[PDB]
Amino acid sequence: HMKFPGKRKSKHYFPVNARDPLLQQFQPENETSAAWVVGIDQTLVDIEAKVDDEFIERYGLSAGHSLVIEDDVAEALYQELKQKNLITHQFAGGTIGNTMHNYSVLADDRSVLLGVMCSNIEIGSYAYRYLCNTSSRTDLNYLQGVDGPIGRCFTLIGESGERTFAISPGHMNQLRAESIPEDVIAGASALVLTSYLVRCKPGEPMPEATMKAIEYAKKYNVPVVLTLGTKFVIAENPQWWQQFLKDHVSILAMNEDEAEALTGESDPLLASDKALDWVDLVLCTAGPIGLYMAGFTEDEAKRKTQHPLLPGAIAEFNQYEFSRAMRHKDCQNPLRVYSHIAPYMGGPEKIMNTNGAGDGALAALLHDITANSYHRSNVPNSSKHKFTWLTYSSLAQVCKYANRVSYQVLNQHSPRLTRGLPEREDSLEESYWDR
Amino acid sequence: HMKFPGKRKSKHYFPVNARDPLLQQFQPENETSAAWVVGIDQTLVDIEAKVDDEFIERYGLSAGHSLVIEDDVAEALYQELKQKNLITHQFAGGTIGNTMHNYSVLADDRSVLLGVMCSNIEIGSYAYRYLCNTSSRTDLNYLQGVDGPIGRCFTLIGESGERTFAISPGHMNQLRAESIPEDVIAGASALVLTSYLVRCKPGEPMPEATMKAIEYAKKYNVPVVLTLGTKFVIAENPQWWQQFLKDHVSILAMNEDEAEALTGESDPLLASDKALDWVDLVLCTAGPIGLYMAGFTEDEAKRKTQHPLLPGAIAEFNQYEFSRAMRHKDCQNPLRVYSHIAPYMGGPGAGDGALAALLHDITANSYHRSNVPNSSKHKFTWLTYSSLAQVCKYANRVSYQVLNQHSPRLTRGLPEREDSLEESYWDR
Amino acid sequence: HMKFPGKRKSKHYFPVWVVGIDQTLVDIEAKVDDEFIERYGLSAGHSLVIEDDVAEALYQELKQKNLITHQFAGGTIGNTMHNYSVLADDRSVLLGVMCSNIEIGSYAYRYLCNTSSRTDLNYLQGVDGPIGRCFTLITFAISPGHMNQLRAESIPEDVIAGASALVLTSYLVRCKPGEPMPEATMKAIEYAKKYNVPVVLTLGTKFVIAENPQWWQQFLKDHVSILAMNEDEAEALTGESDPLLASDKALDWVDLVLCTAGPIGLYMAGFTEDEAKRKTQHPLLPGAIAEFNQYEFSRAMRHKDCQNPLRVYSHIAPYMGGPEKNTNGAGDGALAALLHDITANSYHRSNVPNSSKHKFTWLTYSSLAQVCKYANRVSYQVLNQHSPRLTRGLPEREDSLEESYWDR
Amino acid sequence: HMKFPGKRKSKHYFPVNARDPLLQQFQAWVVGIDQTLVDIEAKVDDEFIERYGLSAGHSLVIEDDVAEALYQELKQKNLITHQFAGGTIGNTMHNYSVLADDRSVLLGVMCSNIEIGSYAYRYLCNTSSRTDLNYLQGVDGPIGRCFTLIGESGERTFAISPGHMNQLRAESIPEDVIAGASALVLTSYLVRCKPGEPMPEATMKAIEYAKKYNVPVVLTLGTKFVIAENPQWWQQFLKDHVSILAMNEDEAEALTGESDPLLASDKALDWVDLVLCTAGPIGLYMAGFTEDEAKRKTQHPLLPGAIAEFNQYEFSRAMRHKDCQNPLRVYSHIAPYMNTNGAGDGALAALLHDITANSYHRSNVPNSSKHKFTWLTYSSLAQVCKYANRVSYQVLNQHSPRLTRGLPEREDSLEESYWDR
Ligand SMILES: Nc1nc2c(ncn2[C@@H]2O[C@H](COP(=O)(O)OP(=O)(O)O)[C@@H](OP(=O)(O)OP(=O)(O)O)[C@H]2O)c(=O)[nH]1
Ligand SMILES: Nc1nc2c(ncn2[C@@H]2O[C@H](COP(=O)(O)OP(=O)(O)O)[C@@H](OP(=O)(O)OP(=O)(O)O)[C@H]2O)c(=O)[nH]1
Ligand SMILES: Nc1nc2c(ncn2[C@@H]2O[C@H](COP(=O)(O)OP(=O)(O)O)[C@@H](OP(=O)(O)OP(=O)(O)O)[C@H]2O)c(=O)[nH]1
Ligand SMILES: Nc1nc2c(ncn2[C@@H]2O[C@H](COP(=O)(O)OP(=O)(O)O)[C@@H](OP(=O)(O)OP(=O)(O)O)[C@H]2O)c(=O)[nH]1
Ligand SMILES: Nc1nc2c(ncn2[C@@H]2O[C@H](CO)[C@@H](O)[C@H]2O)c(=O)[nH]1
Ligand SMILES: Nc1nc2c(ncn2[C@@H]2O[C@H](CO)[C@@H](O)[C@H]2O)c(=O)[nH]1
Ligand SMILES: Nc1nc2c(ncn2[C@@H]2O[C@H](CO)[C@@H](O)[C@H]2O)c(=O)[nH]1
Ligand SMILES: Nc1nc2c(ncn2[C@@H]2O[C@H](CO)[C@@H](O)[C@H]2O)c(=O)[nH]1
Ligand SMILES: Nc1nc2c(ncn2[C@@H]2O[C@H](CO)[C@@H](O)[C@H]2O)c(=O)[nH]1
Ligand SMILES: Nc1nc2c(ncn2[C@@H]2O[C@H](CO)[C@@H](O)[C@H]2O)c(=O)[nH]1
Ligand SMILES: Nc1nc2c(ncn2[C@@H]2O[C@H](CO)[C@@H](O)[C@H]2O)c(=O)[nH]1
Ligand SMILES: Nc1nc2c(ncn2[C@@H]2O[C@H](CO)[C@@H](O)[C@H]2O)c(=O)[nH]1
Ligand SMILES: [K+]
Ligand SMILES: [K+]
Ligand SMILES: [K+]
Ligand SMILES: [K+]
Ligand SMILES: [K+]
Ligand SMILES: [K+]
Ligand SMILES: [Mg+2]
Ligand SMILES: [Mg+2]
Ligand SMILES: [Mg+2]
Known part of the structure; x- marks a missing residue:
């Protein structure tokens, strides 16, 4: 019964709930x-x-x-x-x-x-x-x-x-x-x-x-x-957290200040890249700079971006922005991929709640990762699989989603949301309301 | 901080949040x-x-x-x-x-x-x-x-x-x-x-x-x-419920059978019309027939439908579908108005959902009146923010949502309108 | 040899x-x-x-x-x-x-x-x-x-x-x-x-005006026809902290008002012929004046030239959610845009008497709403750069030939 | 704070104002x-x-x-x-x-x-x-x-x-x-x-x-006559000092003796590193040197000319003969788009833009694929012809040889809807 992560037009159909007709003649009688x-x-x-x-x-x-x-x-x-x-x-x-x-x-x-x-x-x-x-x-x-x-x-x-x-x-x-x-x-x-x-x-x-x-x-x-949980907590013992991430952590959520505290890199892109030595996927919320994402993809399944190549410490760091993230363990020839998005619609008028904003962009990423597990169990034979991915969408698309969510959390007082995102009406639905 | 009732394109702008810049020039020194x-x-x-x-x-x-x-x-x-x-x-x-x-x-x-x-x-x-x-x-x-x-x-x-x-x-x-x-x-x-x-x-x-x-x-x-809560609860003493509604109730929600038990009219439109003798506004869910709504509007502010005129026991009852509902007490020349809509997309606790939509529209009027008292939407003291036709459009869509899921409680609101700028953002 | 005011697609042809x-x-x-x-x-x-x-x-x-x-x-x-x-x-x-x-x-x-x-x-x-x-x-x-x-x-x-x-x-x-x-x-x-x-x-600042607000008012009646302003300068002139109202009160004295409300955006107020009203296709906005953009889409006339003058208003928000980081020179830039539109009317009238855009003695070439669109964009340009002076106009959309030429 | 040369869709992002939050974090x-x-x-x-x-x-x-x-x-x-x-x-x-x-x-x-x-x-x-x-x-x-x-x-x-x-x-x-x-x-x-x-x-x-x-x-x-007085001295000047030569079709015949523009430019390439010649209604030609290792071949049909299929590697970037390790001669030509004196003076400005743009993008973006070697122009010869050809067209539709209206940039997807609102 899970929603689709984001509002982009998808090439593959997303079932949403297992009561779907095509999926019902499809799934087994005993379905988990x-x-x-x-x-x-x-x-x-x-x-x-x-x-x-x-x-x-x-x-x-x-x-x-x-x-x-x-x-x-x-x-x-x-x-x-x-x-x-x-x-x-x-x-x-x-x-x-x-x-x-x-x-x-x-x-x-x-x-x-x-x-x-x-x-x-x-x-x-x-x-x-x-x-x-x-x-x-x-x-x-x-x-x-x-x-x-x-x-x-x-x-x-x-x-x-x-x-x-x-x-x-x-x-x-x-x-x-x-x-x-x-x-x-x-x-x-x-x-x-x-x-x-x-x-x-x-x-x-x-x-x-x-x-x-x-x-x-x-x-x-x-x-x-x-x-x-803040730059100060980490700078006390950066090498302990580093050692912790290698052993256990697979996905790292971060803001630019928290990141320099961990890596010593005032550039989020480099901090995120240095972090990829320890974990499989990194999300770095850079406040007004936007947000970055760094992760791994199979070098054979790399999808090259169609946006202009961005300049940065790593030349053309978004070159394969359209690749999906895998865990380093699951790769045969892992390749590093990076992506960056700017604030939505120029950002808010008021600075507002920048602390809980990062905690929100994370939720967006979790959604996409769960969606992969959901769509894999309901449509296993799909082109969306038989490669063992981590995320359902590409880094570029997941940034698109998480960036939009952070804008939602910044433009309100509380750090907790009460309403999801507004999805598109088809022609039939549109004419219904306009009639 | 309340949302807009429905997804229709609105003539008047809805502030949504009392923080809106256009509204803080408007808003006093203390919270609205x-x-x-x-x-x-x-x-x-x-x-x-x-x-x-x-x-x-x-x-x-x-x-x-x-x-x-x-x-x-x-x-x-x-x-x-x-x-x-x-x-x-x-x-x-x-x-x-x-x-x-x-x-x-x-x-x-x-x-x-x-x-x-x-x-x-x-x-x-x-x-x-x-x-x-x-x-x-x-x-x-x-x-x-x-x-x-x-x-x-x-x-x-x-x-x-x-x-x-x-x-x-x-x-x-x-x-x-x-x-x-x-x-x-x-x-x-x-x-x-x-x-x-x-x-x-x-x-x-x-x-x-x-x-x-x-x-x-x-x-x-x-x-x-x-x-x-079911026809059986009402058939016990239908004239007792009638007396209750006159004195206290102002808005009545019903399904076709619940209504037949109360009024004796197997036609929802007639039952609803008879109910208007006792209350100010009626919502009747007729399952696959759709749902009806009956209420009052000032004969001066009536807005006539642009949809075809429907046949029924009450001739051409949707004639003023586009009017907004008032309470009988607030009207000087009250006029009865009716509207009917069919199930969404042909059909698949639902009634309790269509009611919630109506409540939303009634609260929205109370909200928009306190934040924009100057607007054309308040020359009079209305009950609903939208017209009966528009309120039915909304409540019908909600009941369809409750039907396509198991539980009677919703967990996420309806899909909201995507403008042009958002569309290009996601499609980038 | 003058450029077109703004980058909007025009119904009527501009000679250039x-x-x-x-x-x-x-x-x-x-x-x-x-x-x-x-x-x-x-x-x-x-x-x-x-x-x-x-x-x-x-x-x-x-x-x-x-x-x-x-x-x-x-x-x-x-x-x-x-x-x-x-x-x-x-x-x-x-x-x-x-x-x-x-x-x-x-x-x-x-x-x-x-x-x-x-x-x-x-x-x-x-x-x-x-x-x-x-x-x-x-x-x-x-x-x-x-x-x-x-x-x-x-x-x-x-x-x-x-x-x-x-x-x-x-x-x-x-x-x-x-x-x-x-x-x-x-x-x-x-x-x-x-x-x-x-x-x-x-x-030139709230302080200069607040000294003797009542005098400036009288100055505008006698001489001025168009008033450029920011939100603070406006309260000092009228005593109304609401930019919509201040701009409206100023319309008692002048024919057209442009008020830069910083992050609120910018407002505009003026007069148009009640016969030539063109009503907006945007949502009616709330304000001290109810539904004030109701005729956002009318073109501007001077109060004198109207037979049944009607007050008309428009408001637009900052471009692309405002900047990332010179809040001064912006107003001086937003004004230039309005001048551009007004020059265009006298220009397009002198070069094209046959066009429909001169059915009455107009002041502005475009509609009030369309002019706000233009001035708003210019302010964003003046804010993103350091100095208050521009060095390059706005980029206009090319036809298919330009598209195909550059990509080929 | 420099603009981008031309209106083509670029594979690489151009910073424009050096403020740009991107490059500032690693500046x-x-x-x-x-x-x-x-x-x-x-x-x-x-x-x-x-x-x-x-x-x-x-x-x-x-x-x-x-x-x-x-x-x-x-x-x-x-x-x-x-x-x-x-x-x-x-x-x-x-x-x-x-x-x-x-x-x-x-x-x-x-x-x-x-x-x-x-x-x-x-x-x-x-x-x-x-x-x-x-x-x-x-x-x-x-x-x-x-x-x-x-x-x-x-x-x-x-x-x-x-x-x-x-x-x-x-x-x-x-x-x-x-x-x-x-x-x-x-x-x-x-x-x-x-x-x-x-x-x-x-x-x-x-x-x-x-x-x-x-x-x-x-x-x-200036004019053919200025050169026909002493063609051989100008040639000798170009070898020692000049690295880039600007010319029109008549001025060129006087210096090289070739009624064919393509050959004349090629002859001049022995003395300098890059040559641009305005061929009036025939269009305009461009000739220069490129590294033979990084040559990039055209996607247009191969043209007939004094040098057959001169546009064979139209899409390369130009280097100096001195900066090349194994130079290759490369040629390109474009026809008129859609004051015959000041138009050429304008196309030169266009090329300068691209050459500075390379100098600008190199100091602001050292890491990019656009600076492996030490190039001269930011864009390809075919792309550079597009720009200068476009500029000369503007100079003709106006009286003066100096511009007041630079080129109009492409309206974006986001902006266009704004102006349509
Ligand atoms: N516009 C845009 N596209 C993106 C982005 N991220 C990924 N894509 C594209 O999505 C395509 C893959 O579709 P899937 O991810 O398998 O299907 P989905 O629609 O369910 O996500 C890839 O193209 P492909 O399969 O390599 O090319 P094609 O086969 O789709 O033509 C990739 O180029 C993005 O941020 N923006
Ligand atoms: N398409 C459609 N329209 C409906 C429906 N119900 C009411 N309307 C129209 O809405 C108009 C009134 O707008 P409001 O109710 O005041 O504004 P709002 O839409 O933002 O709440 C009425 O037109 P009016 O004011 O008489 O004409 P006009 O002034 O809107 O041109 C009426 O015809 C419906 O079910 N479908
Ligand atoms: N897109 C857009 N249009 C606006 C705006 N403000 C006013 N208009 C429209 O412009 C039309 C008048 O066009 P002009 O102003 O004469 O032409 P222009 O494009 O060269 O300025 C009006 O209706 P029309 O039906 O188009 O004119 P007509 O065809 O009936 O003469 C009006 O609806 C705006 O902000 N954006
Ligand atoms: N359409 C077109 N393209 C030109 C022209 N001249 C050069 N190019 C292309 O530019 C590409 C090199 O891009 P850069 O010069 O580094 O980037 P830029 O767009 O910012 O200039 C080459 O393609 P590539 O990277 O080898 O091709 P691809 O792999 O991107 O398809 C080459 O094909 C021209 O006149 N027209
Ligand atoms: N994420 C990540 N894991 C690595 C890297 N290098 C080695 N490993 C892991 O370290 C272990 C040693 O082979 C294996 O689990 C590898 O996958 C690296 O750069 N990044
Ligand atoms: N778990 C946890 N959350 C905290 C702590 N301090 C602040 N927060 C939360 O962080 C959010 C703001 O970023 C709010 O939800 C706070 O309640 C802490 O020490 N532990
Ligand atoms: N609901 C309702 N009240 C009515 C009607 N006619 C008279 N009244 C009563 O008359 C008074 C005037 O509003 C109130 O007590 C109403 O309840 C009617 O048709 N419906
Ligand atoms: N208040 C109330 N709700 C009930 C009763 N019986 C069933 N329901 C609820 O009605 C809904 C189904 O229409 C479910 O939420 C039921 O729990 C009852 O006696 N009282
Ligand atoms: N600008 C402006 N001039 C007005 C207004 N009402 C009257 N006038 C002019 O003031 C003078 C005295 O009536 C005449 O020139 C009128 O046209 C108004 O509302 N605005
Ligand atoms: N005319 C005039 N311009 C001023 C004055 N003070 C500042 N400016 C200019 O106003 C611009 C900033 O809005 C700058 O160009 C300033 O130099 C003043 O007293 N008179
Ligand atoms: N531009 C250019 N210089 C050449 C050529 N052949 C030799 N040289 C000169 O030889 C030296 C080696 O780069 C420099 O002085 C060059 O100018 C040629 O074909 N073109
Ligand atoms: N420097 C210079 N410019 C000239 C000369 N003759 C014409 N021009 C300029 O060349 C341009 C026409 O190509 C005009 O701006 C002329 O003024 C000359 O002898 N020297
Ligand atoms: K790890
Ligand atoms: K009552
Ligand atoms: K709860
Ligand atoms: K005056
Ligand atoms: K000068
Ligand atoms: K040389
Ligand atoms: Mg945090
Ligand atoms: Mg000012
Ligand atoms: Mg010359």
């Missing part, structure tokens, strides 16, 4: 299908508000950071916002919670979320709000119970632009590795993680559970995906 | 505020499964009904479904929960639901599921706590497409009149009820709270909306 | 001048610290005059440490006439001052080597002093020199008589008293009324 | 010498031509008093129709900047005191904006006047009143300006001067710098 995506996150609740730069330093914060805070310092901040009646919005959050939420909206298929949740949920609470607000098709039944509160992210915006985060973890890192459902990760087409998962008070089991999901991920050949 | 819709329901959870028509009779059920059952009968049925591993789908339900859910998906604005909810919610439970599944923009913060379980609706399919429903109410009818948020209903553009709300064990407060919600609705001149 | 007054200026650009501004008694966002010796002190600090980045011709009306000639490929006459003896490498030298070719400077007036120096600090610091010494005898009556518009800036009355520039300006306006030449006015 | 002009001249155009009788010792189709110097008599009769009878800046190289530097929207430096003379309304004033108000005249030299005399005398037939006779136009001194040649250039442009008229005037000496000092810093030298011709 049902392709999904799973991620791990620190169950969080955003509490957004604008504040003075005085409010920032008064609580030991720095602009543009994501800093954890002590429990007593947080209650002091919580009380000052209710006193001054400064709170503007309360909604679900989490770099990966947002991503799973946006995935379900874009594809209208299920996503499983792994994390924590109050064992007893009272109405009107932060844990309650998290549920009423989470997307419908996002599945929260596999969460784990905790006797404490879920996490609170005090998103402080201040003057136009930089959005500061202050985290009251609560029990958000109390996820145990026994709570990782083996069967869910096996039938997944990607496992999505964020750099914030290692940031925890020592001894908390979240990292223990995260590595356990990766165990299952490797068992069943499920790509591991990683998004990053 | 969006509108919303509220409804009351028996918090329910659908539990779908196929069974024999033999299985139906084994629990005192009839094909095609919606029947309550006692707790011992319910625990036996639940155990038999888990035993044979027969359950196929579990999701949120309720005639009005669905409608409020679909409204939020279609409009992308907030909807308030009033009802019950376990005060202690354990993970994996039914009360848990209700939350994880309800749409985001549907607001459940105003539900009421209960020491019991929410309702379970066992949807049983009879192989021919027949849907039998077996209801284990639990505490779903325990909504108290104090729990009705007065301020929520005041800023609403409609209060939505379902005929199922009167079905409860004696002494339970649900009816008391219902009368209390309607009380607030009249305070602030909020239209009351009523959808019906 | 304007005069203005300015304080002859030369831009000298440099970026500086916010400390540098207060160190010389300046304020941000102004155009503040400075003395000749104080000007020499600022000039010298820029030469020592070499902070000057770019030097080019300037002046709100110098830019506008310059950009007009680039866009239309027709002549524009500029009136002002100029060193009577010009040495190679000088500032007066540069102004000539840099001014557009098709722009005609022969009617300038000689002065034994220097032209003006504008020190652009990223605020403007002005060393007037002799820029305001234009004498009214130097106003060529015959030039303005055969013109289709006279273009002025509010900066022409801002001068040390006793300098003759304002007198020369009034003489041009006197000539303009004789031969029925529309008067055009762009404004 | 060029042409100079010429001319006799400062002013065109004064007018229609005249065939009696008017002979009356001052002139012949139709020449560019003839005249005495100062012979000029004063001619000037006075044109004002008396009110015969002058247009007055504008001129000079075979003045046109070129002007037209280049119009087409490329980048700077061009011009070297010459100019009144040290310029009064309003004068000819020196007019020259500046009229010169292209982006043309830089700051490096000119001051002179205590009047600038040159070229009286363009046209007849009803169309013959454009030229009468030159040199004044001090040939007083350019070799010290006034800016050493560094020519160094960072991509071409040094000269005209056959620079050696033609009254004896003792230093103008030819200044030319040789500019050429010194050109070879010093490896700047290709360019040469355009």
